[PDB]
Each structure stands twice: as structure tokens, then as C-alpha cells.
Design a protein around this ligand. Sequence first.
Ligand SMILES: [N]S(=O)(=O)[C]C1234B567B89%10B%11%12%13B85%14B%1158B%12%11%15B%139%12B%1061B%12%112C5%153B%14874
Ligand SMILES: [Zn+2]
Length: 257
Amino acid sequence: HWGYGKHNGPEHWHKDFPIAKGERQSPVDIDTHTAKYDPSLKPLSVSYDQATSLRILNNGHSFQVTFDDSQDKAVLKGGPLDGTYRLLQFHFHWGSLDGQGSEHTVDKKKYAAELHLVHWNTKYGDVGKAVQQPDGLAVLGIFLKVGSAKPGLQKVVDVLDSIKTEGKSADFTNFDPRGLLPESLDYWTYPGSLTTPPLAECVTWIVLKEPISVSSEQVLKFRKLNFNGEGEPEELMVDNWRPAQPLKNRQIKASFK
Ligand SMILES: [N]S(=O)(=O)[C]C1234B567B89%10B%11%12%13B85%14B%1158B%12%11%15B%139%12B%1061B%12%112C5%153B%14874
Ligand SMILES: [Zn+2]
């Protein structure tokens, strides 16, 4: 294999992963006028002070920064969630140009990119078990628009030349993901899925309303990555986003008025 191209992209994924046509697929369009403010939703608790980043990896579909998830060091709680969710990794989706790249949309607006911080529910013990449960994962989604640089992203940007092609990884210690967060933790939430194969319907989505700004130079560096492995014909890693999927009567809830 799956990818993002004509012959292996999102419109093909259902053949290997029939849940692609399921009842709670992601991403979705967030219709801001229809999302209901839910005064019972709690503030989101993001505790990243003790995060331990390990590696940065080009997996042929994105790049990811991986964390030590063997203890409760970087956890998401509160908001719509019951219990504690450990940060495993973050990665991005982005476009070939600034007018596309996000997976979620807001009133049909596409952002230039979308950051996903993937967490798993500690009551299932490991991520592989969590992916088999309807409340197994919590993904914090953050939109990126192009304007001013995000200083906390620069450390990531600057090592991407060392992981150009599928396969490649590098040490990436002491990275603080707090530097990627917007001011506000106001959010929308809904029950959904992974947005890449296996498309498992295991995710509570928490999508922040406030985008972060990144510079054109920062996103340009994303666009120099390659989908291909070294030695294979060069295919820029761009447009690695799944389009919005049918909502199927799910309710999107807002934490804010
Ligand atoms: N856009 S997404 O659904 O967060 C991608 C991932 B992260 B890892 B494993 B974890 B699960 B599979 B692998 B990357 B693909 C799915 B989730
Ligand atoms: Zn993702």
C-alpha cells in the first residue's frame, strides 16, 4: 504494498483492509457548526515533561519520532478519555503544495500538514493489544499552516536529510514534543480509526482547534523526503494523506463554545 499513488493509494486499501469501508473510519471533515459543545468534556491533560525520544525513522509512508513507552513518562489523560495513554510516537502528513496535506479538514478546509501524536491505553499493556480494542488508542491531531517558523520543529527538520529514503533511521534523543503544541488545548473529539493500514477502528481522536504555524522552509524539508528506498526511482514523499471518510452519523463533540 500500500501507498499513496494511483495504483496503491487510499482508494485501493479496502482490498487488503476491508475495514476501510467501516463504520468509524478516519479522517473526517469537522463541520464546526454541527459539532456540539459538550460541557461534560474535561480539559485535556498532556503530561510530556518526562518524555524520552529514542529514534527518528523514515517508514516509507511518513517519518516518525519514537518514544520510550515502557513507563508512564509522556501520557495523555482527561478530555474524553478514561484512564492513561502512553505516547509511542509522532509523525506527520503533508502535501505537495500548501493547500493540501491535512487528513482532517475543518469546514472542508485543508491545512498544509497534520501532526499525529499516537498514544495507547495502558490497560491493554502493549500497543499491539491496544489496536484490537475500540478504546485502545488516543491520537492527538494538530494542524499545521504555513507562515512563521515553529522553533520547536527545527531539530526535527534538520535531521531529515539523514533519513531521506525508506528504511533509514537516526538517533533522536532529548526531543521535547511540548515545543510542537499550540497555546490552546480546545479540541474536537470523535470515535475513529487509524488513517493508514491496518485502518483499525481503535482510536479516540482529539483534534486541536488551534493550528501551529511552520515556515515554508520547514515544510519544504518534509517534501524532500522520499517514499522509495535508496537505489529505487526517486518519488518525493508528498501527499501522504488519506482523504475525509464518511461520518456515518457519529457525533463530533467540541470541548469549547
Ligand atoms: N495516522 S496513524 O493512524 O496514526 C498511523 C500509524 B502509527 B504506527 B501504527 B501506529 B498505527 B499503525 B503505524 B503508524 B501506523 C498506524 B498508527
Ligand atoms: Zn497519522
